[PDB]
Design a protein around this ligand. Structure first.
Ligand SMILES: */C(=C/C(=O)N(C)C)CNCCOc1ccc(/C(=C(/CC(F)(F)F)c2ccccc2)c2ccc3n[nH]c(F)c3c2)cn1
Ligand SMILES: */C(=C\C(=O)N(C)C)CNCCOc1ccc(/C(=C(/CC(F)(F)F)c2ccccc2)c2ccc3n[nH]c(F)c3c2)cn1
Lengths: 242, 232
């Protein structure tokens, strides 16, 4: 199906890992004043500000993910529109691994469960994120594995379409699936290099990709809450630079 | 411990043996929004009874705590209905085989509230399974994975659940190796299938939002039915 000659598809596993590690966005500081007690609007202010800012840098990151700028502009936009909260979340749970009971939103913004209660609904999402981070800590998730998963989330985010598909959209989806197969290869390689048996490799690949269902769930629940606070892309198009 | 000893071939055998009966709708051969929702609700409610009986036969599930058995089914039931739907629908491009006498096209999908958006997503997933030539043996592995995964993070009890999930991954790989796939092709197909499950979860979440909205005729809430059938 795909007609595109994409550099990503002929990268070796090591080269894919290197490119992903190089793409990582900068580490950002919240505008959080620790002498200021939290209220609902103040916490939602802090988080929203952090999310808006992370989104700018996420655009720059996505441009450096091999295979991503080979998609049509419309398809790049769609992936980012679908995936942004999942991508924030996986970042959060990775950073929070060595902080049992707490979510490291930023270096200066470390929140425990109880501080989630200052916003209606949000402690439910907090618990799920905490559980996810503990899961990654127990599995001893490696940085190289993390960046593979975050790229998988981006590429897998798009809405499934049958009646709503065009011949062109279908070529684009085929290109996505090839990029995804390269990332799977890269994950397996990393595992094989770390000394896992073949059985252990296939088991861990499954365990990590099953956690992505949980990330999707958390994002969906997040989105429901944001939509019900009346939140409501010309950036995206123009930053993605076409 | 019997469950944890199963070979790949034995796992397949047990899961195939656990499969529920295929149900018929009460459909009488015109569809309103109200009669369609009525038909779908009555079907879902009858499927649920058989889903509970099925889950009791998935290796390892009756080793779990009552809480875990109830919680896994409460979180997963719509995903489980949906995977079964898209599987049954693979030989019916553009349609959804809710039951043998209830085969619906997207036109009929517009009958009911926020089914229309979900409908195309289900058709696409069916189409993806068809294109991948998903086999029945792979389908029952994936459906048991949904059960054991959908509530597992939402400590030694979580370990048992994880060990059984690993066994099913081993079973999938075995099936693929037996079908002639290379090791590379095995790991790629595994990943492709598990990423589809993210999308099934998303479809279920979207469906749940409409069920909460709408809402119901909730005489026997699912949590009560689960407790009755599993406390027992
Ligand atoms: C009462 C409210 C609650 O459910 N609640 C949690 C407060 C209604 N309870 C009975 C369950 O009702 C029910 C379940 C499933 C479906 C259903 C569909 C069809 C589709 F969208 F998934 F395609 C549905 C329609 C509209 C909104 C949500 C879901 C359905 C029914 C039967 C199925 N068999 N295989 C499947 F995949 C099915 C899906 C409707 N109502
Ligand atoms: C909507 C307008 C509005 O609030 N009103 C009142 C009109 C704002 N729309 C922009 C997006 O805002 C966001 C995005 C993300 C979040 C994050 C959270 C935290 C958690 F729940 F995910 F934990 C959130 C809170 C409440 C509901 C949904 C999400 C968030 C922020 C920063 C992050 N960095 N890494 C992450 F994982 C997150 C998550 C808040 N507001």
């Amino acid at each position: 199906r795909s007609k595109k000659n994409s550099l990503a598809l002929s990268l070796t596993a090591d080269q894919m890992v290197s490119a992903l590690l190089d793409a990582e966005p900068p580490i950002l500081y919240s505008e959080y004043d620790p002498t200021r007690p939290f209220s609902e609007a103040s916490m939602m202010g802090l988080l929203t500000n952090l999310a808006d800012r992370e989104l700018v840098h996420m655009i720059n990151w996505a441009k450096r993910v091999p295979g991503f700028v080979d998609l049509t502009l419309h398809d790049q936009v769609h992936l980012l529109e679908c995936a942004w909260l999942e991508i924030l979340m996986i970042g959060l749970v990775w950073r929070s691994m060595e902080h049992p009971g707490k979510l490291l939103f930023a270096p200066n913004l470390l929140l425990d469960r109880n501080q989630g209660k200052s916003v209606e609904g949000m402690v439910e999402i907090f618990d799920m994120l905490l559980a996810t981070s503990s899961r990654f800590r127990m599995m001893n998730l490696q940085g190289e594995e993390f960046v593979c998963l975050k790229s998988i989330i981006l590429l897998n985010s798009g809405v499934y379409t049958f009646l709503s598909s065009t011949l062109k959209s279908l070529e684009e989806k085929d290109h996505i699936h090839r990029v995804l197969d390269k990332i799977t290869d890269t994950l397996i390689h990393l595992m094989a290099k770390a000394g896992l048996t073949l059985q252990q490799q296939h088991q861990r690949l499954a365990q990590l990709l099953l956690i992505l269902s949980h990330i999707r769930h958390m994002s969906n629940k997040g989105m429901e809450h944001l939509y019900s606070m009346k939140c409501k892309s010309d950036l995206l198009l123009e930053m993605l630079d076409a």
